[PDB]
Amino acid sequence: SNAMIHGIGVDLIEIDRIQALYSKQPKLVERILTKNEQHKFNNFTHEQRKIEFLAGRFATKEAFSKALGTGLGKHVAFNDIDCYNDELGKPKIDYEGFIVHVSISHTEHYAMSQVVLEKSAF
Template sequence: MIHGVGIDLVEIKRIKEWYDKRPTMVNKILTDNELEIFNKINLDNRKVEFISGRFAVKEAFTKAMGTGIGKKYGFHSINCLPDENGKPEIACDGFHVHTSITHTEKYAEAIVIIEKDNNKQE
């Protein structure tokens, strides 16, 4: 059963300006596991795309959960890591989370569909 659907669109230019002014802002958005991936990226543009995508997917996740960032879920409580094929995944106890992130030159967009796990109690 679908619990919720969330979508978020981020202007990459806005994230780049934020990152250029305060590079440590990544520590507010990315978890330690995500930072490991981020730190292995060599191209600055790709780094900004990564931050933008993770920002968007976390916003989309909280929209799908119906909470918004900062209430029940914060940026550090949502860990979005690639599976063995590179597909972004978010693990959340009691739910099955479907995620997708896409980028263009100007935007990063994410969609999240959350299903209740019928085998677990909330």
């Protein structure tokens, strides 16, 4: 554990899969998003923006899990990873022991997210 980066993660998600499931099970939102993220999700005036936000959050959490190492990451509830936005709108995640770097991108049909977990200490 001499490396300064603990791990990296990336996840690509088809918007139509998220849309399908949200339509088939609206309580999907409560299973992926924190209360804070739900507040945001419910505040979007446009349904397509809601689905994009949800897809981006799902991809981000999957990327975060992959950066941790799936063997550990699968034990972290989505509800416990709060991806919030700073004052410039940049996505952020706080997680003790790391400096978490996140980036999200959207097209009409896909959402993707990248996470790099930098170690906070030597």
